[PDB]
Ligand binder design. Structure first.
Ligand SMILES: CC/C=C\C/C=C\C/C=C\CCCCCCCC(=O)OC[C@@H](O)COP(=O)(O)OCC[N+](C)(C)C
Ligand SMILES: CCCCCCCCCCCCO[C@@H]1O[C@H](CO)[C@@H](O[C@H]2O[C@H](CO)[C@@H](O)[C@H](O)[C@H]2O)[C@H](O)[C@H]1O
Ligand SMILES: CCCCCCCCCCCCO[C@@H]1O[C@H](CO)[C@@H](O[C@H]2O[C@H](CO)[C@@H](O)[C@H](O)[C@H]2O)[C@H](O)[C@H]1O
Ligand SMILES: CCCCCCCCCCCCO[C@@H]1O[C@H](CO)[C@@H](O[C@H]2O[C@H](CO)[C@@H](O)[C@H](O)[C@H]2O)[C@H](O)[C@H]1O
Ligand SMILES: CCCCCCCCCCCCO[C@@H]1O[C@H](CO)[C@@H](O[C@H]2O[C@H](CO)[C@@H](O)[C@H](O)[C@H]2O)[C@H](O)[C@H]1O
Ligand SMILES: CCCCCCCCCCCCO[C@@H]1O[C@H](CO)[C@@H](O[C@H]2O[C@H](CO)[C@@H](O)[C@H](O)[C@H]2O)[C@H](O)[C@H]1O
Ligand SMILES: CCCCCCCCCCCCO[C@@H]1O[C@H](CO)[C@@H](O[C@H]2O[C@H](CO)[C@@H](O)[C@H](O)[C@H]2O)[C@H](O)[C@H]1O
Ligand SMILES: CCCCCCCCCCCCO[C@@H]1O[C@H](CO)[C@@H](O[C@H]2O[C@H](CO)[C@@H](O)[C@H](O)[C@H]2O)[C@H](O)[C@H]1O
Ligand SMILES: CCCCCCCCCCCCO[C@@H]1O[C@H](CO)[C@@H](O[C@H]2O[C@H](CO)[C@@H](O)[C@H](O)[C@H]2O)[C@H](O)[C@H]1O
Ligand SMILES: CCCCCCCCCCCCO[C@@H]1O[C@H](CO)[C@@H](O[C@H]2O[C@H](CO)[C@@H](O)[C@H](O)[C@H]2O)[C@H](O)[C@H]1O
Ligand SMILES: CCCCCCCCCCCCO[C@@H]1O[C@H](CO)[C@@H](O[C@H]2O[C@H](CO)[C@@H](O)[C@H](O)[C@H]2O)[C@H](O)[C@H]1O
Ligand SMILES: CCCCCCCCCCCCO[C@@H]1O[C@H](CO)[C@@H](O[C@H]2O[C@H](CO)[C@@H](O)[C@H](O)[C@H]2O)[C@H](O)[C@H]1O
Ligand SMILES: CCCCCCCCCCCCO[C@@H]1O[C@H](CO)[C@@H](O[C@H]2O[C@H](CO)[C@@H](O)[C@H](O)[C@H]2O)[C@H](O)[C@H]1O
Ligand SMILES: CCCCCCCCCCCCO[C@@H]1O[C@H](CO)[C@@H](O[C@H]2O[C@H](CO)[C@@H](O)[C@H](O)[C@H]2O)[C@H](O)[C@H]1O
Lengths: 203, 201, 460
C-alpha cells in the first residue's frame, strides 16, 4: 500500500532552519503532487505542493518561509522551514490524487520552535483546611520543556490538564477527587531523567 | 484563495444522527473533500467530490450542490466522535474549515481553589490553582484578589470517556512581593444561573 | 408490386437513431464521463472499453437469435424493433444520467451502457436483414440501401449537431489546480446533457414509429436459409482469400485510426487547442465537410480510378494531423484542418465500400460456391472494429489516467497534453500508415484485373 514515513519531532531554536523528510513508498513519487500542510492547535493550513518531476507551488503566505525539494533517487520529499517562532505546529505530507485535488494518504510530524531545556518542579497543592465527603487534591508541574507522564499509585480518578506555555517553559496540573485520605503521592514522568515523586500532605 | 468554513466548531450528538455543514465562499461546483481526524492521527479521507466514499463505513454520507455542503453520519459510534474537516479542490489554493463532534451530557459544575505550597513559596513564587473537574458546556473563570486580575493561565482537557464531562484548570502566578492583596477568590460562571465562588485568605 | 418511395424513405428514416446515438456516444461520452460525470479516468476507461466490447460480442449472438426467430403475426424483425426501442431509449437516457450514488457510479454506467448496446444491437441487427425481408428484387434492395446510407450520413450529421449545440449551450466551471497557481453551474451542464438525451430519445421513438408504420415484411419464403453452423467455415474461407483479407485489414486499421480520433478528439480540442467554448463547432465543421466531400470522392473514384483515390484519401489527414500539434492553437488553422479532416473522414469511410465489388467479383471468380460472403465480411469488419476501437479508447483513457488527467481543469499538465498530441498525431498516423501498407499489397490492382474478373462474371 502507499505510505509516507515522516521524520520525528524536532526542536528548532527561534531562527534556525528545520528540514522534514517524507520518504514515500507504494507509488511512483514522480507521478503525483506531494503536498505539505500546517496544523496548529486546531487549524489546517497549506504551505505548498511539489511535483517530484518538476515545479513547486507555494502559498503566498509561505513564499520565502518554506522551501520544498524532492529526491526521486530515494523517493523522499523534503520541506525546509526558514525563520520560526510561530511555526511550532504539526506538518502533514498528503499526496494528491492525480485527477481530483484531495489527499488520500497522509503522514504527520511535529515541530516545536522553542528554546531551553530545564528540569520540572513539582508542587503538591492541597486543600486549604476543609472537607465534605470527597476532597480534591492537586499536583502542579512547572518549568519544563518536554512531554511528561504524570501518574498516581493505582488510583483512577485523576484529571491531568494539558500543558501550557508560560514564558518559555511548560506548566501542567493534575486533580484527584478522592474520598478518603490515608496517603496520596504524585509521581511525574519527564523521560529525560529528573524523576521526582512527592507525597501530598495536609494543610 | 477561497474561504471555505465549518460554522459549528463543536457539535452535540450521542447516537442518533449528525449533519456537519460546510459553506464555501465561492461556487466550487460540488468539489468538496471531507476528512476525519482522530487525536494523534493524521486526517483520513472520507468523502471526495462531495458525495463519494473512499473505503469508509456506510454511515458516512454527504450532500451538497454549491456553496452549501453537508456530511451526515446517521450511525454515530464512539470512533465517529472526532474532528471533521472540509476541503475544496476547485481553486489552486486549497482551504479547510475545522469542526468537532461531542456527546451530550447533563449539567452541573464543581470548583475548588488550592493555595500555593510552601515549596513554591520558598523558591520565589506563588501559584493559586482553581480546579473545575466536572461540568458540561462552556464555563468562564475570573480571579479576584479583591479586584479582577488578567494574569492567569487557563487550560482545558477534552471530554472524559466515562463521565462525558469537561474540566478546566486556572493558574494564577503571583510573586512573593505582590503576595499581599488580601484574599484570593476564584469565580466560575456556567449554565447554572449563578456563579460559584471559592476563596482563601 | 414494388417498393414505394415512401416505404423506402420510412425504412431509411428508421436507420437514423443508430447513427445519432453512435455519433453521440462516440464524440461526447468521453467528455461526459471524465468531466460531467466526474469519474476517475481508470473507471471511464473500463466503461468505454467494456461498452464498446459488449456491442461487438452481442452482434453475432443477436444475429444468431434473429436467424432462429420464427414468423410472428407482425413479422420476423418488427417485434424485435417494437420490443427493443422503449427499453433502448430508457437505457440511453440513463447513460447520460449522473446518479446520486455514494460508491460505484462505474457500475451504473457499465450496466446501462451495456444494456443500451445490447438493445441497440437488438434494434439494428433485425434492421439490417429488413432490407432482404422487404422485397425480392435486387434493384429495390439497392435503392433501399442507398436511401439508408444517405439517411445514415444525414443522421450522423444531425446527431452531432444536436448533441454538440445542446451540450455546448450550457457551459460549466472548471477545477483550478497547482499548474494554474501563478452564471452557469455543473448541474446546468448535466441538465443540458439530459435535455440532449431527451431530444435524441424523442427522435429515436419517432423514427421507430415511422419504421413500424411504413415498412411491411412481405412474408418471404424462397430459396434456402443457408447454414448457421457454417459461420466459422465461411469466416475461414473469407480469411483465406487474398484481396478480401487485404481489404479487411486495410479498412480495419484505417477505421481504427479514425475511431481513435473520434474518441480522443474532443479532449484534444478542449485541452490542447484551448477551445472548450467551441469544441462542438469543430465537430460540426468536421461532420459538415464529411457530408459535403462524399460527392467529391465519388467523382474522384469515378474519374481517377480507385487505387490513387484510396492512396491519397486516407493519407490526406496526415499533414493536417501533424499541423494541429505543430501550431500554437490558431483558430483558422484548426478550422482549415477540420475541413481537411472532414474530407479525409469522408474518403476513409466511403472508398473501401467502392473497392468492395471488385473483390466480390474476384471471390466469385475464385470460388464459384459462395453464400453470404459479403454478410460474413461485414460482420467480421463490424466485430473487429467495435472490439479494437473499445481497446483503443480504453487504452487512451487509461493513458490519460496514468498521465494525471485532472477532472475538468481549464488546463492540463505537461504529460496529459503530450499524451493527447500522441493520441491524435502519432497513433492515428501509425495506424493509417499500417492500413496504407496493407492496401499497397493489393493483388486485384484496381479494375485492371477486376473487370477481367467481371468478364469471367459474364462467363459464369
Ligand atoms: C447528403 C449526403 C451525401 C451523400 C451520401 C450517400 C451516399 C452513397 C455512398 C455510397 C455507396 C457506394 C457503395 C455501394 C456499395 C454497393 C455494393 C454492392 O454492389 O452490393 C453488394 C455486393
Ligand atoms: C475486465 C475489464 C478491465 C478490468 C481490470 C481489473 C480492474 C477491476 C476493478 C479494480 C478497481 C480498483 O482499482 C483501483 O483501486 C484503488 C483503491 O484505492 C482505487 O482508488 C484510487 O483512486 C481513488 C480516487 O478515485 C483514490 O482515493 C485512491 O487513493 C486510489 O488508490 C482506484 O479507483 C482503482 O483504480
Ligand atoms: C425528412 C424526410 C421527410 C420530409 C417530408 C416527406 C416528403 C416525402 C414524402 C414522400 C412523397 C412521395 O409520396 C408519394 O409517392 C408516390 C410514388 O410512390 C408518388 O408518385 C409519383 O410522384 C413522384 C414524382 O412526381 C415520384 O416520387 C414517384 O416516382 C412517382 O411515382 C406520389 O406523387 C407521392 O404523393
Ligand atoms: C433535409 C432535406 C431532406 C431531403 C428532401 C426531403 C425528402 C423528400 C423525398 C426525397 C426528395 C424527392 O424524392 C425524389 O423524387 C424522385 C422522382 O421525382 C425520385 O426518383 C425516383 O423515385 C422512384 C423511386 O423508386 C421511382 O419512381 C424512380 O426510380 C425515380 O423517379 C428520387 O428517388 C427522390 O429523391
Ligand atoms: C427525423 C425524421 C422525421 C420523420 C417525419 C415523418 C416523415 C415520413 C415521410 C413520409 C410521409 C408520408 O408520405 C406520404 O406517402 C404516401 C405514399 O402513398 C403519399 O400518398 C400518395 O401516394 C399515392 C401513390 O400512388 C398517390 O396515388 C396519392 O396521391 C397519395 O395517396 C402521401 O402523399 C405522402 O404524404
Ligand atoms: C427517455 C426519458 C424518460 C426516462 C424515464 C425514467 C427517468 C428516471 C430519472 C432517473 C431517476 C433514477 O435515479 C437514480 O435511481 C437509482 C435507483 O432508484 C438510485 O440508486 C439508488 O439505489 C441503489 C441500489 O439500491 C443504491 O446505490 C442507492 O440506494 C441509490 O443510489 C439513484 O440514487 C438515483 O440517482
Ligand atoms: C461485464 C463484466 C465487467 C467487468 C469489468 C470489471 C468489473 C467492474 C469494474 C468496476 C467494479 C467496481 O467495484 C465496485 O465498486 C463500488 C465501490 O468501489 C461498489 O459498488 C457497489 O456500491 C454500493 C454498495 O452498497 C451499491 O450501490 C452497489 O452494490 C454497487 O454499486 C462495490 O464495492 C464494488 O463491487
Ligand atoms: C434524421 C433523419 C433525416 C431524414 C433524411 C431524409 C432524406 C432522404 C434522402 C433521399 C435519398 C434520395 O434517393 C435518390 O433516389 C434513388 C432511388 O430512385 C436512389 O437510388 C439511385 O442510386 C442507386 C445507386 O446504387 C441506384 O440503385 C440507382 O442509380 C438509383 O436507384 C438514390 O439514392 C438517390 O438518387
Ligand atoms: C442538404 C439537404 C439534405 C441533403 C439532401 C441531399 C439530396 C440529394 C442526395 C440524395 C442521395 C443521392 O444519391 C445519388 O444517386 C445517384 C444515382 O441517381 C448516384 O450516382 C451513382 O452512384 C452509385 C454509387 O454510389 C453508382 O451505383 C452509380 O454510378 C450511380 O448510381 C450518386 O452517387 C448518389 O450520390
Ligand atoms: C443540418 C444540421 C442542423 C440540423 C440539426 C438541428 C441542430 C440545431 C441546433 C440544435 C440545438 C438548438 O438549440 C441551440 O441552443 C443554443 C443556446 O441554448 C443556441 O446555439 C448557439 O450556440 C453557439 C455557441 O457558440 C452560438 O455561437 C450560436 O449563436 C448558436 O448556434 C441555439 O439556440 C441553438 O443552436
Ligand atoms: C431534427 C429534429 C430535432 C431538432 C433539434 C430539437 C429542437 C431544438 C432543441 C430544443 C431544446 C434545446 O435547447 C435548449 O432548450 C432549453 C429551454 O429553453 C434552454 O436551456 C435552458 O436549460 C439549461 C439547463 O438548465 C440551462 O442552460 C438554462 O436553464 C437554459 O439555457 C436552451 O434553449 C437550450 O439549452
Ligand atoms: C425535452 C426536454 C427533455 C428533458 C429530459 C426529459 C426526461 C424526463 C425524465 C427525467 C426528468 C429530469 O430528471 C431530473 O431532472 C432534475 C433537474 O431538472 C434533476 O435535478 C434534481 O436533483 C438535483 C440534485 O442536486 C437538484 O440539484 C435539482 O434541483 C433537482 O431538480 C434530477 O436529478 C433528475 O432526476
Ligand atoms: C489497438 C490499438 C491500440 C492503440 C492505442 C493508442 C495508445 C497510445 C498511448 C500513448 C501514451 C503516451 O505515453 C506518454 O509518452 C511519454 C513519452 O513517451 C511518456 O511521458 C514522459 O514524460 C514525463 C515528463 O513528466 C517523463 O517523466 C518521462 O520522460 C516520460 O514518462 C509516457 O510514456 C507517457 O506520458
Ligand atoms: C509521427 C509524426 C510526428 C508528429 C508529432 C507527433 C507528436 C509527438 C511530439 C509532440 C510534441 C511534444 O513533444 C515533446 O515536446 C517537449 C517540448 O515541447 C519535449 O521536451 C520535453 O522532454 C522531457 C522528457 O523528460 C519532458 O520532461 C519535458 O516536458 C519537455 O522538456 C519532448 O522531447 C517532446 O517529446
Amino acid at each position: 500500500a502507499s505510505k509516507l514515513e515522516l521524520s520525528g519531532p524536532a526542536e528548532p531554536r527561534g531562527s534556525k532552519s528545520a528540514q522534514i523528510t517524507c520518504k514515500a513508498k507504494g507509488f511512483p513519487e514522480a507521478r503525483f503532487w506531494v503536498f505539505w500542510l500546517f496544523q496548529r492547535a486546531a487549524a489546517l493550513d497549506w504551505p505548498a505542493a511539489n511535483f517530484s518531476g518538476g515545479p513547486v507551488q507555494f502559498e503566498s503566505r509561505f513564499q520565502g518561509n518554506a522551501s520544498l525539494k524532492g529526491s526521486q533517487a530515494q523517493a523522499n520529499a523534503e520541506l525546509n522551514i526558514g525563520a520560526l517562532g510561530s511555526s511550532t505546529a504539526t506538518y502533514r505530507c498528503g499526496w494528491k490524487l492525480a485527477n481530483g485535488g484531495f489527499f488520500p494518504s497522509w503522514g504527520g510530524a511535529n515541530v516545536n520552535g522553542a528554546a531551553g531545556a530545564k528540569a520540572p518542579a513539582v508542587y503538591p497543592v492541597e486543600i486549604s483546611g476543609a472537607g465534605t465527603g470527597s476532597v480534591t487534591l492537586g499536583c502542579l508541574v512547572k518549568g519544563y520543556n518536554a512531554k511528561p507522564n504524570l501518574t498516581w499509585p493505582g488510583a483512577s480518578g485523576a484529571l491531568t490538564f494539558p500543558s501550557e506555555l508560560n514564558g518559555a517553559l511548560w506548566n501542567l496540573a493534575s486533580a484527584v477527587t478522592g474520598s478518603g485520605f490515608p496517603s496520596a503521592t504524585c509521581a511525574v514522568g519527564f523521560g529525560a531523567a529528573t524523576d521526582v515523586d512527592k507525597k501530598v500532605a495536609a494543610a | 484563495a477561497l474561504d471555505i468554513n465549518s460554522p459549528e466548531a463543536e457539535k452535540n450528538a450521542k447516537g442518533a444522527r449528525a449533519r456537519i455543514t460546510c459553506n464555501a465562499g465561492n461556487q466550487v461546483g460540488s468539489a468538496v473533500a471531507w476528512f476525519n481526524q482522530r487525536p494523534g492521527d493524521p486526517a483520513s479521507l472520507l468523502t471526495y467530490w462531495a458525495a463519494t466514499e473512499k473505503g469508509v463505513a456506510g454511515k458516512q454520507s454527504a450532500q451538497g450542490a454549491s456553496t452549501k455542503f453537508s456530511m451526515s453520519s446517521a450511525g454515530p459510534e464512539a470512533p465517529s466522535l472526532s474532528s471533521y474537516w472540509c476541503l475544496l479542490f476547485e481553486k489552486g489554493a486549497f482551504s479547510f474549515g475545522g469542526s468537532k463532534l461531542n456527546p451530550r451530557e447533563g449539567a452541573g459544575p464543581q470548583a475548588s481553589i488550592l493555595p500555593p505550597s510552601a515549596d513554591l513559596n520558598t523558591s520565589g513564587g506563588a501559584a493559586v490553582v482553581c480546579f473545575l473537574p466536572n461540568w458540561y458546556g462552556n464555563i468562564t473563570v475570573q480571579w479576584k484578589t479583591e479586584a479582577p486580575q488578567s494574569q492567569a493561565n487557563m487550560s482545558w482537557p477534552g471530554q472524559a470517556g466515562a463521565n462525558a464531562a469537561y474540566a478546566m484548570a486556572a493558574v494564577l502566578a503571583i510573586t512573593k512581593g505582590d503576595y499581599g492583596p488580601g484574599s484570593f477568590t476564584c469565580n466560575a460562571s456556567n449554565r447554572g444561573t449563578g456563579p460559584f465562588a471559592m476563596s482563601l485568605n | 408490386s414494388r417498393l414505394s418511395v415512401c416505404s423506402k424513405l420510412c425504412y431509411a428514416i428508421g436507420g437514423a437513431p443508430y447513427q445519432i446515438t453512435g455519433c453521440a456516444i462516440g464524440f461526447f461520452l468521453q467528455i461526459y464521463l471524465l468531466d460531467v460525470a466526474l469519474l476517475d479516468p481508470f473507471y471511464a476507461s473500463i466503461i468505454l472499453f467494456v461498452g464498446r466490447a459488449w456491442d461487438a460480442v452481442t452482434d453475432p449472438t443477436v444475429g444468431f437469435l434473429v436467424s432462429r426467430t420464427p414468423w410472428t403475426r407482425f413479422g420476423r424483425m418488427m417485434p424485435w424493433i417494437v420490443l427493443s426501442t422503449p427499453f433502448a431509449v430508457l437505457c440511453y437516457f440513463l447513460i447520460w444520467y449522473v446518479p446520486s450514488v455514494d460508491q460505484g457510479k462505474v457500475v451504473w454506467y457499465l450496466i446501462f451502457y451495456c444494456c443500451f448496446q445490447t438493445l441497440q444491437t437488438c434494434f439494428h441487427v433485425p434492421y439490417s436483414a429488413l432490407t432482404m425481408f422487404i422485397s425480392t428484387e435486387q434493384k429495390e434492395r439497392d435503392s433501399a440501401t442507398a436511401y439508408r446510407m444517405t439517411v445514415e450520413v444525414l443522421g450522423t450529421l444531425i446527431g452531432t449537431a444536436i448533441q454538440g449545440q445542446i451540450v455546448g449551450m450550457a457551459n460549466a466551471p472548471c477545477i483550478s489546480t497547482e499548474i494554474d497557481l501563478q452564471h452557469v453551474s455543473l448541474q446546468d451542464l448535466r441538465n443540458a446533457y439530459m435535455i440532449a438525451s431527451g431530444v435524441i430519445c424523442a427522435i429515436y421513438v419517432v423514427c421507430a414509429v415511422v419504421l413500424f408504420l411504413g415498412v411491411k415484411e412481405q412474408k418471404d419464403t424462397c430459396r434456402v436459409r443457408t447454414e448457421p453452423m457454417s459461420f466459422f467455415q465461411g469466416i475461414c474461407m473469407v480469411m483465406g482469400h487474398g484481396p478480401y483479407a487485404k481489404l479487411v485489414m486495410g479498412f480495419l486499421f484505417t477505421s481504427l485510426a479514425f475511431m481513435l480520433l473520434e474518441g480522443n478528439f474532443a479532449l484534444f480540442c478542449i485541452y490542447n487547442l484551448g477551445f472548450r467554448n467551441d469544441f462542438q463547432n469543430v465537430l460540426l465543421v468536421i461532420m459538415l465537410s464529411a457530408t459535403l466531400a462524399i460527392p467529391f470522392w465519388q467523382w474522384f473514384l469515378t474519374k481517377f480510378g480507385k487505387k490513387t483515390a484510396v492512396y491519397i484519401g486516407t493519407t490526406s489527414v496526415v499533414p493536417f494531423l501533424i499541423s494541429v500539434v505543430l501550431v500554437p492553437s490558431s483558430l483558422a488553422v484548426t478550422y482549415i484542418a477540420s475541413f481537411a479532416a472532414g474530407v479525409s473522414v469522408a474518403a476513409a469511410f466511403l472508398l473501401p465500400w467502392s473497392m468492395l465489388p471488385d473483390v466480390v467479383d474476384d471471390f466469385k471468380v475464385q470460388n464459384p460456391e459462395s453464400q453470404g460472403h459479403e454478410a460474413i465480411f461485414y460482420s467480421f469488419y463490424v466485430f473487429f472494429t467495435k472490439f479494437a476501437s473499445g481497446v483503443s479508447l480504453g487504452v487512451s483513457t487509461l493513458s490519460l489516467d496514468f498521465a494525471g488527467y485532472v477532472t475538468r481543469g481549464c488546463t492540463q499538465p505537461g504529460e496529459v497534453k503530450l499524451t493527447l498530441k500522441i493520441l491524435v498525431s502519432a497513433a492515428p498516423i501509425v495506424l493509417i500508415i499500417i492500413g496504407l501498407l496493407i492496401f499497397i499489397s493489393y493483388p486485384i490492382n484496381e479494375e485492371k484485373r477486376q473487370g477481367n474478373r467481371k468478364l469471367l462474371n459474364e462467363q459464369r
